[PDB]
Each structure stands twice: as C-alpha cells, then as structure tokens.
Symmetry: T
C-alpha cells in the first residue's frame, strides 16, 4: 500500500544546513521517521528528493500512472511552478502539500501556493511532523 | 496536558447542515472523536463552540492564562477578525489553525487568514481529521 | 408562509437618528408597515433587529432550519462578515439583501458586499420601500 | 404617470435565447407583463429596447426633457459606458437600474456599474419581476 | 486651413442641460463662436456633434483622408473607446483633445484618457474657451 | 458550411491606411482572399465589416440563430465591449477571435480581451493569414 | 461634564498581559488614572471595556443620545468594523480615537482605520498617556 | 491685469538643453515671447523660474496675497509635491497648469499630477505655445 | 530550406493518453505523425521534440537561433513562468509561433499572461492540436 | 529640557490664510501659545518654521546632535519626503508628529505618512491644541 | 588629461556614520571624501566630492556636470525614491551616470526598492558600502 | 580565497549572440578576464555557467559547504526562482548579484529580483566590468 513522499529543491540539505529555519532532522533521518510511521500505519512509503524539476515531474507522472497518493514538499517551486501544478493536477489519488516552516509567518510571496488549489489539503508549520501527519491522513483515506 | 479545541460561528451545525462543504460528522460526534483520540494520546481535550466572538475571545484568554495549547477553527472570523488574531497572539503554548475545507480551492478571499502568521501551524482541507492530526502534533510537543 | 425580515446593527435607531442618511421612518413604523404589507399579500412577517452578530446568526440558522425566506439588511456587517455570508449561504429558501441607502453613491468600501453573491437578489437605495418590494417578490416566489 | 422601461443590447433576445441565464420570458411577453402591471397601478409604461448606444441615449434625453421616470436595464453598457451614465445624470425624475441576473454571482467585472452611483436605486437578481417591482416603486413615488 | 471640431455624446445638449458642469453655452452658440474665431484667424471651421460612435469615427476617417486637423471633445468616449483612439491615431495633421470640465476635479475614472497619448495636445477645464484656444494653436501651425 | 467573417471598427480602412501596423492588404482584397480560400476548403464565407457596434451585434445574433461559425476581428471593441462578449457567448457554433497585429507586443491594455474567454480560440499576430487559418480550422470542425 | 472612555476587545487584559506592546498599566489602574485626571480637569469620566461589539455599540448609542464626548480605543475592531464606524458617525460631540501602540510601526493592516475619517482626531503611540491627552482636549472643547 | 508665469526645476535650461523633449526655445526667448503676447492682450506678465521648491512656494504665496492669476509649469514637482499643491490650492485667482511635453505619451508616472485637481485648467503637449494660450484664456477670464 | 522546429514543454509527452478532457485525445506520437503529414503537404521539413527539462528546451531554442530556423513552441506551464525561456526565444531571427492547445483565457486567471507572446511573431490558442498544423501553414507562407 | 517644535512648508501662513482648514490662529500666536504652555510645564520650547526642506533637515540634525525631542508638523512633506523621514529616524529623543487637520477625512493620499512609522507617536485633527498635547507628553518623557 | 569625476551625495549624507553603522558603515562623510580622493589619484582621475541637503543645490551640481560633460557618481539618498526633478536633471547628462547606494536598498522597506534614477543611469551599485563609490570610480577609469 | 563566479541560463552565448544587449565579450573571453583579474587581486576565481537550475543549485550548495563567496549572474532566474533564492540565502560568505544590462531600463518585470534582498550587494548595467568590480569588493570583504 504505497505512498510517495517527494521533496523538492535544496531539501537534500535538511537538518545539516538552515537548522533554525527547517529543523535539525536530516533528510536521511526523515526518511527513517517516515518509514517508521508508514510501518505503524500499514503503508509502504517511498521517499524521493531532487533539485531537478524534470525529475520531480517524472516522479509525479509515475504516481499518476500508478494512481498512488503523493505527499509533496515542493520547496521554492511551490510558489513558482505552473508545470509542477499541472503534473500534480493529473493525480487521481490524494495529494498532500507539506511545508516544514510556517510560510504565513515569512515573506509575503510565500503566502501563495500554486499547489494548494489542486491539493487535497495542506499542512504548514508543523515541522517534520507534517509529513507524518500527512501519512496518517492517507492511512484513513 | 490539556488541549482546548475551539470552533467559531456556525460550526455547531456541522454534519447536519452543509454536509457537502464541511463533512457529515456532527459537532456532537466531533467532540466524541476528539475525546477518543485524546485518550489514546494521553491528553485531555476540552472542545467548545460559539457563534459569539466575545465568547471565543474569553476562551482564548483562559487558554492564555493557563498556558494551554489551542486548536482553533475560527470559521468566517479567520478572514476578518483582528481582535481574534490579537487574542491568539498572546498564547504562549502552541496554536494550531484548522480548516475542514480546502480554503485554497474556494473563493479568493478565503486564501487569506489573519491567524496563520501568529499560529504555530495550519491544517487545511483534511476534513474533521485535521482536528485529530492537530492533537497528535501537540502530544509530540 | 412566514417571511423573516432581519435588520443588523444600529438599525434600531432608524428614523429618529441619521434621518438624512436612512430616512425618517422609525423601526417600530417599519415593523407595522411590513406587517400591513404582509397581511395584504397573505404572508406572515417576523421582523427582528439586533446589534449582536451572534443573534443575527441564530435568526439566520432558524430560517435555514425552517426553510423560510429572509429579507436581510445586515447594516455594516454586509461589508465585513464572512460568518454571516456563510450562515446565509445555507438558506434553501430565497434571500433578498436590502439596503435602504444607495451604497453605490457613498464610500467605495460600501460598494462591495459579502452577501450579494450568495443572495437571490439585492435591492439598494429605494428606502424602506425596498423591504416592501422584497416581500412582494417573495409572495410570488 | 408615464414610465419608460429601456432595455439595452441583446435584450430583444430574452427568453427565446439564453433561458438558463436571463429567464424564459421573451421580450414581447415582458412588454405585455409590464403593460398589464402598469394598468393595475394606474401608470402608462413605454417599453423600448435597442442594441444601439446612440438610440438609448436619445431615449434617455427624451425622458429627461419629459421629466418621466426611467427603469433602465442597460445590459453590457452598465459596466462600460460613461456616456450613458452622463446622459442619465441629468434625469430629474427617478432612475431605477435593473439587472435580471444576479451580477454579483457572475464574473468580477459585472460587479461594477457606472450607473448605480447616479441611480435612485438598483434591483439585481430578481429576474423579470425586478422591472415590475421598479414600477410599483415609481407608482408610490 | 480647414479644421474639424468634433463633439461626442450628449454634447448636443450643452448649455440648456447640466450648465453647472459644462457651462451655459449651447451647441448652436458654440458653433457660432467657433465660426467667428475661425474667420478672425483666417481658417474655416467645420463643427459637428453626434451621439453615435460610428458617426464620430466616420468624421475622423474623413479628416485622416483629407489630412485635416481635428479638435475633439469625445465626452464619455474619452475614457472608454479604444476604437476612437485607433481612428484618431491615423490622423497625420494635429489632434487637440478638449474637455470643457476639469476632469481631474471629478470622479477618479475621468482622470484616464485613451486619446491623450495619441493627441498632439490636451486642454482641460477652460470651458468652451478650450476650443477657441485649440483653434489658435492650429492657425499658428 | 456557411462561415461569417466579421470585422469591427476602422477595419474598412485596412491596407490603404496604417500599412505598417495592419499590413498592405485592403478590405476588398481581404474579402477576395477569404472567398478564394473558403472555395478551396469547401465552405462559403460571408465577409462583413462595420464601424457600428449595433450592426456587429445584429450579425452575431444572426449567426446564433443560423448556428453558423464566426471569425471575428472586433478591433478596439475587443478590449471594451461587454455587450459584444454577451452576444458572442450565445453562439453555439465555434467562434474564432482574430487579431492581425500581435496585441501582446503593443500597449498593456491590448493584452486583455473580453472575447477570448468565450471564444473557441484565438489567433493573434499572424496578419491577414490569421483569417485564412481560422477558416481551415472551421473546415475540420 | 461626562466623558465616556470606551475600550474594545482584549483591553481588559492590559498591563498584566503583553506589557512590551501595550504597557505595564492594568485596566484597573488605567480607570483610576483617567478618573483622577478627568476630575482635575473638572470632568467626570466613565470608563467602559468590553469584548462584545454589541456592547460597544450600545455605549456609543447612549453617548449619542446624551450628546456626550467619547474617547474610543476600539482595539482590533478599529481595522475591521463598519457597524462601529456607523454608530460613531452619529455622535455629535467630539470623538477621539486612541491607540496605545504606534499602529504605523507594526503590520501594514493596522495602518488603516475605519474610525479615523469620522473621528474628531486621533492619538496614536503615546501609550496610556493618549487617553489623558484626549481628556485634556475635551476639557478645552 | 498682472499674470505670474512660474517655471519650476531645470526649466532655466530650456531650449539650449533637452531640445528634443522640451523644444528649442530658450528661457530668455520664452520670457520675450510671453512679454510680447501680454502687451498685445493688454496684460502684464511677470515670468520667473527657480530650481528651489521654497522659492516657488514664496512666489505662489505672493500671487495668493495679491489675488493674481498664475500660469505654472512645475516640471518634475507636478508629479511629487504636495507642499506645492497646498500652496496652489490657496490661490483665489485662476491657476493654469502647463506642460510643454505631452506627459500622456511618456512614462506612466507623468500621467498623474498633484496640481490638476486644484487647477482651473491644464494645457499639455502644445509646447511653448501652451503658456501663450493660457495668457489669452486669462485675458478673457 | 524551410526546416521548422516544433518544441513541446513539460508534461506534454503525456498528451492524449492522459488528461484527454483538457488537451485532447491525440498522443504525442500521433501528433508527430500529423505534423509530418502536414509538413509534406506544405513542402517543408518539421522536427518535433518534447522535454520536461527547461535546460533541454533552451538548448533546442539555441540550436534554432544558430541555424536561423523558425520555431513553433508550446512551452506548457513555463509559458507563464520562465523569463529564461523568453530570453532564449527573443534571440530567434526566424519566426516564433506560440501555440496553446487549450484556451488559456477560459481558465485560471494566471494562464492569461504569457512571457512569450510579446516576443513571438504570433500566438494560436484554443484550437487543439490543429494549432500546430496552422502554425506550420503560416510558416510555409510567412 | 529644550523641546523643538518644527513647522514645514506654508505653515508660516497659518490663521491669516486657509482659516476653515487649519484654524484662525496665526503662526506668531501659535509660537506664543507654545512658549507659554512650555513654561507652565517647566520646559523651554524653540518653535521654528521653514518652506525649505534643507532647512528642516538642518534643524532635525541639530536636535539629533543635542539629543532633544522634536514636535514636527511637516505639512505636505509628511506624505512625500523620504529624506525628512531618514533625518527624523536619527533622533534618539521622542518625535511627535502633529497634523492640525484630520488627514483621514481628506484626500486618500494624505492617509499615508512617511513619518508615522519612525515617530514615537502621532496626533491628528485636534487643531492647534495637538502641539500643546505633544508638549505635555514630552514633559512626562 | 586628468579626467574629472563628480561625486554628489544628497540629503543627510553629510551625517554618514552618525547611526546606523551596520546599515551605512562608521566612516564619516569627510573620511569618505579622503578615501575617494585617494583612490581617484591612484586611477589617474580627479574626484570632486560634494554633498548637500538642498535638492536645488544637487540640481545645480548636476547642471554643471551636464555643461562640462563630466561623469557623475550619485548617491541621492532619500530623493532616489521621490524626486522626478532630480531624474529629469540627470537625463540631460551626456557622460556616464553611476547611481550608488551604500546600503542594500532591497533588504529594507519596500518603498526603497524603487528608484527614479536607475532607468536613466548607466548603471547602479547597491549594498557594497562605501566601497561602492570606489568601484564606480574604477568603472569610470576603464569604461 | 577561492571566489565562485556562476552564470545562469543562455549566458554561455555571450558576445557571439545578442551583442547589442549583453556586449561583445564571449563567455570564454570573460572566463579569461576574471581569472587574470582575480590573480592580480591575490584570489582564485572558479567561473562556471549552466542552463540547468539544478546544476546552479549544486554549485551554490558547494560554495555554501566551502564557505566561499559567490558572484552570481542568474540570467532570467533572477526574476523567477525562489528555489535559487533559498539556496543562496544559506551562503555565509558574501554574495554579489551581477547584471550586465541595466535591468531598470528594460521591461518592468526585470526590475524585481528574488536575489537582491538576500545578496550582500548588486551591480547592474556596468557590462562585463561588473564581474571584475565584484571581485575587487571580495578582495577587501
Ligand atoms: O530551500 C529550502 C526549502 C525551501 C522552502 C521550504 C518550504 O516548502 C517549507 O517550509 O518546507 C517553504 C518554502 O517557501 C520554501 O521555499 N531548504 C533548504 C535550503 C538550503 C539548506 C537547507 C534547506
Ligand atoms: O460557516 C461554516 C464554517 C465557515 C468556515 C469554515 C472553515 O474555517 C473550514 O473549512 O473549516 C473555512 C472558512 O473559510 C469558513 O468561513 N460552517 C457552516 C455554516 C452553515 C452550516 C453548517 C456549517
Ligand atoms: O448604521 C446604520 C446602518 C448602516 C448601513 C445601512 C445600509 O445597509 C443601508 O443602506 O441600509 C448601508 C450599509 O453600508 C450600512 O452600514 N444605521 C444607523 C446608524 C446610526 C443611527 C441610525 C441608523
Ligand atoms: O446580453 C444579454 C444581457 C447582458 C446583461 C444583462 C444584465 O443587465 C442582467 O442581469 O439583466 C447583466 C449584465 O452584466 C449584462 O451584460 N442578454 C442576452 C444575450 C444574448 C441572448 C439573449 C440575452
Ligand atoms: O455627457 C456630457 C459630456 C461628457 C463629458 C464631457 C467632458 O469631455 C468635458 O468636460 O468636456 C468630460 C468627460 O469626462 C465627459 O464624460 N455632457 C452632457 C450630458 C447631458 C446634458 C448635457 C451635456
Ligand atoms: O483600428 C484599427 C484596428 C484596431 C485593432 C485591431 C486588432 O484587433 C488587430 O490586430 O487586428 C488589435 C486591436 O487592439 C485593435 O484595436 N485599424 C485601423 C485604424 C485606422 C486606419 C486603418 C486601420
Ligand atoms: O488586543 C489587544 C489590543 C489590540 C489593539 C490595540 C490598539 O488599538 C492600540 O495600540 O491600543 C492597536 C490595534 O491595532 C489593536 O488591534 N490587546 C491585548 C491583547 C491580548 C492581551 C493583552 C492585550
Ligand atoms: O526637467 C525639465 C522639465 C521637467 C518636466 C516638464 C514638464 O512639466 C513639461 O512638459 O513641461 C513635463 C514634466 O513631467 C517634467 O518633469 N526640463 C529640463 C531638464 C534639463 C534640461 C532642460 C530642461
Ligand atoms: O501540463 C500539461 C500542459 C500544460 C499547459 C499547456 C498549455 O500551454 C496548452 O493549452 O497547451 C496551457 C498552459 O497553461 C499549460 O500549463 N499537460 C499535461 C499534464 C498532465 C498530463 C497530460 C498533459
Ligand atoms: O500647506 C499647508 C499645510 C499642509 C498640510 C498640513 C497638515 O500637516 C496639517 O493638518 O497640519 C496636513 C498635511 O496633509 C498638509 O499637507 N498649509 C497652508 C497652506 C497655505 C496657506 C495656509 C496654510
Ligand atoms: O538619510 C540617510 C541616507 C539616505 C539613504 C541612503 C541610501 O541612498 C544608501 O544606501 O546610500 C539608501 C536610501 O534609501 C536612503 O534614503 N542617511 C542618514 C540620515 C540621518 C542621519 C544619518 C544618516
Ligand atoms: O538570456 C540572457 C541573459 C538574461 C538576463 C541577463 C541579465 O541578468 C543581465 O543583465 O546580465 C538581466 C536579466 O533580466 C536576464 O534575464 N542572455 C542571452 C540570451 C540569449 C543569447 C545570448 C545571451
């Protein structure tokens, strides 16, 4: 029972870098927390990260083809990519948009998401735990 | 830990009314779902609903005086009330903003919240499960 | 067949106060006129005024729960209250928004209404006669 | 005791065309309904329609010179024509602006009217009955 | 030198109607004043007025073909007509845009002209004398 | 298949005037080109041009009643006329909006069209060949 | 003689809460200070506070009936309440708007007041002292 | 009749500099042209120029105390100076605003003037002849 | 000559088999064949390429600039977002035709601004897959 | 303590000019009212006025070097001068911004001030007494 | 021939270094004059450094640079965001015009992010402190 | 001290292409100038260009890990990429944004940069010398 967790640009540097903004949990550690949560919930999680929009697009395409759910933290592309929104709008299974930081407590431009209108829902500002909460929503359909 | 769940105007009519927009769970069923989850999590939850902004402020003021966290669905007041923002800004414990519907998939005016900048985080679009995921975040502190 | 006529804040002071803006008809006179008109049309009118948004909401919920039509002059809340729009949006019977003054010949902020998009129709600037015309529309459906 | 009902562009196609938006009553049927109501009220109704802004302006100039009340559904020109607004501004008798459809539940651009600020009042969204309610107002004023 | 003076919608009613706004001089009186001033300057003035945009465009098309200058008071069309701008932009002889009233001392929407950017110049607010002053400019070159 | 090609204000002057902006083809030459291409395609084209909005609306009403497609270059009316949009919105056959010039390489105001949202599609900047391409689209339905 | 000082929502928590933003003076201490100052000026101060818009409207109605001056710190309602502005607009005696904090040094949204254009004057950012200065104004008229 | 012609910053360098924007006529030449024109009209013209806003305000103050008309080319201050507008608003004799260039055919910012709303009228884009047309207007009143 | 490059941007490799209600039922392969058939009618050669990679798109645009060949471009979502793509297209000396399969003016407001239109020779919107074939015929004649 | 009261352009004309807008007190009389009120408070007031922005800046620099507070009515520069704002931001002692008129009951452009965000506070609409109230604030520090 | 370059500083810059030294540095206007004169000597230029709080004085300096056909390095301080008159005087310059801001005007209030001068300037240097003037001088010395 | 000079999309085509916009110096020639100049300064420059946003992010991540300064000409990404801004914001060493062209003398959209607010400084419009000037800044910190 497969859920894709997909992280966009720069997020490979979590924890190690920008800890005051995005937390101390590294990308490897987050993969381990997601896999733990997934197991408890009876799901298989697949965690991917890329700085390449083309790569991200390809993973979304695969998830639309497999009709699998997607938890997506698109990084800066959240606020800028129509191409990413159009790939995501193809998904039939739920799409949960996640932001680690509270985008509403930062610069104004971070308060607009291209993904939110086509997502099932959005979790913002709850740190790493956002991913884990999103998983639990998907376990409940 | 004591967690205050507070619902704003009209939300007493959940499930019985507007089920296409806000779900089929009644307010009474919500309260019991929340108590069930709080028990599992080892928290105590107190859920309250009012159509009166003054009553909402009073509950916020009490959570402020007790340093207790708040999970708040302010209903229409999310987009309109600076008084409620200012009450909420005094809270020292976490404040989680919850919207049952995906306010990003509705009218443009719903895409702006006065609470998000001062909230710890926001959960939108995940139905009644939003309140349960918020509790789970507060349990992990 | 019952029609609810609901007046929002300050409108208890009609006639006696601000006559150059909202006319020289008092709220007591307006109730008697409306009852008179309702009698001739074979309707029953229940006319209620409050300065409290919560009380205005409760009256709207009652019309919703009764599937009775509403003629609403929300006063200042017309331009500010999403909570009120949301309660009115749940009405299954007609809603006619009424403004005594011509809100388009005043400050630009009075030219936007949260109610209009969700109302059946709107009558503006015809004085107290707007309520009587709204009745007659309801009498024919 | 003579009232001019002026319909702007495309409105000769009412009923037989675009029923879902502007209703199933044809322009002929509308003229007949207006004349019947005028008879009931003790008024004479002169109902004219034109696709030409120049012809509409001439009819407005004529009502200005005759000191006759006007009920105007200007159609598209409502949102676009300063010239029509300036012609209306010299009317000494009342001007009632009428829209069949609820212009506030349609494209954002329909929510601005060059006419409303200079009108005695405005009726929107009440269908064809809006002309009949405008007539009744004029009969009582 | 043949100079065309062209007046747009409603200006056939100058002097008689709206004199607090556009002065007390009538359109027949204006023609006379312009003709007299033209004789003094050694020009011939042709003065026309129409409420019909198509008619105004035909007059502009004729001045374009004859390479004759235009003094234009487009009335409300100043703020609204791209088609009139496009016809005026063809003129090879000078175009002088004239407003009797001071459009900057009125509604905000009067402060934008589609004609000013393509005109040789603009005269506003100087009453009927604007036309006479434009004529003298055109005599000088 | 009958196809109506409708040109709006000023476009009677194609080619002999403003050749740098709208090309060297005259209106008479355009009709001939269009007729010869419709002949090759197995279609009959009726080409009409008018500076009068009322006249344009009449031809659009006719195409609606006849269920015939329209290729429309509305000229300046593109950017200004809601009445023209509303008449076009009733067409049941395809509507193709054509602009000879590239309206996106010119003033900011030419970048918005009231017609594009209700057209089947739009061709901009391809010169007179744009009418002939529109014709080929209609030949393939 | 009587001056009405009215404090809006959350201001009962002055002093003991948010001392960095609104000062260390409690609402009880403020009442005492105003009452003493007023008495030294030969005035009698009545100091009110409520979290309920409706109660605030009721106090302003009574000050309008009594033709007494009002010093009003509306809190969050300053930026949001048209109903309050409308009640305040009928006051015949002076209306002084007071803000303890400098609203122009905080979020952009606090730089707009619905009250300031209908107030006699406004004092901002002078702390608790603003209410005492407002009293001294009223003592001079 | 004494008329003051006042030129603002940089205009001492007219004619010699920026001749492609503001013409070839020098400030010395412009003074002699204005003096010759004024003799012809039976007026006295006093022509002054300064780069100093304080000095232009002092001249406007003198024309206010003396109730003398002003022809003002404020140059860049037209778009920026509220202090200059406020001095000019005090003038009881006419105020004619002049721009040598067509400010509507240049950058967007030159299309708003602080002076135009408090001016008697405005003349734009007719080069130096603007000052002469304004003199002639004042000779007539 | 008359070699023309048809370039499709992101997600457009999934034409026809996916989102048929918004972009039509013609597949990318089918579209390549239709354009080739049309190209043979017109006496020109069409090269059709597609990529989800902005850098790849830019490379194809550079190659067209260097070869002074015209381009028919459907940039997909990048139409609305990429200044880099606009700047590469602005170097083109031969014509550039912007094509959208859907009618972008009947959709979300953000789709009604293109960064490419001001620098394109022209734009065809809303005419389905036939927009590419119409752009080819324009190019065959100028 | 030395307090500096600084008046900006045109305020040397107070009283004698524009009486209905800025009151009937002359600048000479304002200076004596201030000096007297300062004595009473045991302060020394220095009151100065200039139409020259460079002069106001010099006075502000001098207060910065002396660590003296300033009461500033900048007149038109309030809404326009970033240089004045930056000079004022250098002040370590309090800065009180004063407007005689209620700038929020006038043109929209006067509702924005460059000074308010850097001033300690602001007093608007209380006439000449606003300076006296500012002085009293400064007496209490 | 020793090329003359005019360095013109607008309002409040005579108080450089009074505050906010993290935004504007701790170097004073007179110390700046000396650093610029020295760098200019090294480059073979002659720097004329002038400062005024009077817009009319700044226009008069710009008028002289226009008549002399001399390059200008301009830090107009607050008038950058407000003065059309200053822009229109600068538009008349035939030699290069380099706009300099000591602070990073894009890291501060939004109203600082618009300059009336940048469109008419040869180019603009921002956020590089006082070194911005010296870099402007070096650009002028090369081209 | 190693300095990274990173050029974004299409800049590999400098000099040979678009010379009227970005100069006659090729990218190879620019690499030449920079390496030399850096050596003169006692620095070592590593100059890289790519059309791939993911490749540019990788080079930024490397400079962030190495604590090395960055001279960045992002090309069109300057106006569009929040992902690039976020990668840059992590740099601890100085970041200098360079534009060869004067972006303020072009289209309005080029006047906004996502990089400038997080950069140390920005050099624009100085052609290729802007890179050399930036190196000289970094030689000094
Ligand atoms: O660049 C980023 C992530 C950017 C980013 C993330 C968010 O989605 C979020 O809160 O998760 C909000 C959104 O506005 C945003 O752009 N991270 C990074 C950069 C360098 C080093 C370490 C981490
Ligand atoms: O009025 C409301 C809720 C209003 C509301 C809720 C949200 O916070 C949310 O999605 O939870 C979104 C927000 O924009 C909003 O205004 N509910 C109701 C009304 C009538 C009958 C039954 C229920
Ligand atoms: O405050 C009000 C009504 C306010 C009000 C009414 C309108 O709906 C309308 O035209 O009916 C327009 C709307 O913009 C508005 O806010 N009335 C009042 C106040 C004091 C004393 C006496 C009467
Ligand atoms: O074109 C129109 C009416 C247009 C119209 C009318 C309104 O005033 C109204 O609600 O009555 C709202 C206003 O926004 C508008 O433009 N009707 C039509 C068109 C084709 C066929 C049949 C009928
Ligand atoms: O309708 C009009 C003139 C309209 C008009 C004129 C102006 O060009 C000008 O000031 O000359 C300003 C412009 O904003 C405007 O719209 N006049 C009219 C109407 C009824 C009766 C008598 C006269
Ligand atoms: O006035 C016009 C056409 C104007 C026009 C046409 C467009 O639809 C187009 O590109 O076809 C774009 C649109 O913005 C516009 O308004 N032509 C003309 C005027 C005078 C003399 C000769 C010809
Ligand atoms: O909520 C408020 C006051 C709010 C408020 C006050 C102001 O009028 C002012 O400066 O006096 C400015 C205005 O923008 C604002 O909204 N106070 C509070 C909240 C929680 C705990 C303790 C005190
Ligand atoms: O600086 C200016 C004139 C400024 C100016 C003039 C206008 O009022 C007008 O057209 O008369 C339009 C207005 O927008 C503007 O700012 N002139 C100058 C500058 C340098 C050398 C020689 C002459
Ligand atoms: O993502 C896209 C194309 C996106 C796109 C194309 C358009 O240029 C156009 O109408 O051709 C309009 C434009 O606004 C847009 O972004 N297609 C896709 C996505 C998933 C599966 C199958 C196809
Ligand atoms: O020009 C002015 C003052 C202008 C002015 C004053 C205010 O600071 C204030 O209310 O005190 C509000 C602010 O908006 C403004 O511009 N006065 C004047 C002019 C001519 C003759 C006599 C007096
Ligand atoms: O007034 C100023 C500098 C003004 C200023 C400087 C900038 O040009 C720059 O970064 O160089 C950016 C620009 O936004 C700005 O206004 N300084 C000051 C004021 C008072 C006391 C001491 C120093
Ligand atoms: O595409 C670009 C650079 C684009 C670009 C550069 C700038 O940063 C700058 O001024 O250096 C300004 C910025 O607005 C921008 O987008 N160059 C190119 C394109 C094709 C062929 C040859 C060269």
């Amino acid at each position: 029972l497969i859920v894709n967790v997909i992280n966009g640009p720069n997020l490979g540097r979590l924890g190690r870098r920008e800890p005051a903004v995005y937390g101390g949990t590294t990308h490897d550690e987050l993969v381990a927390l997601i896999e733990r949560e997934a197991a408890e919930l009876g799901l298989k999680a697949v965690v991917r990260q890329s700085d390449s929009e083309a790569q991200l697009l390809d993973w979304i395409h695969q998830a639309a083809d497999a009709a699998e759910p997607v938890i997506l933290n698109a990084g800066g592309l959240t606020h800028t990519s129509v191409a990413l929104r159009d790939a995501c709008a193809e998904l039939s299974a739920p799409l949960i948009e996640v932001h680690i930081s509270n985008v509403h407590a930062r610069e104004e431009f971070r308060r607009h998401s291209y993904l939110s209108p086509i997502a099932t829902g959005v979790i913002v500002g709850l740190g790493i735990q956002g991913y884990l909460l999103a998983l639990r929503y998907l376990a409940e359909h």
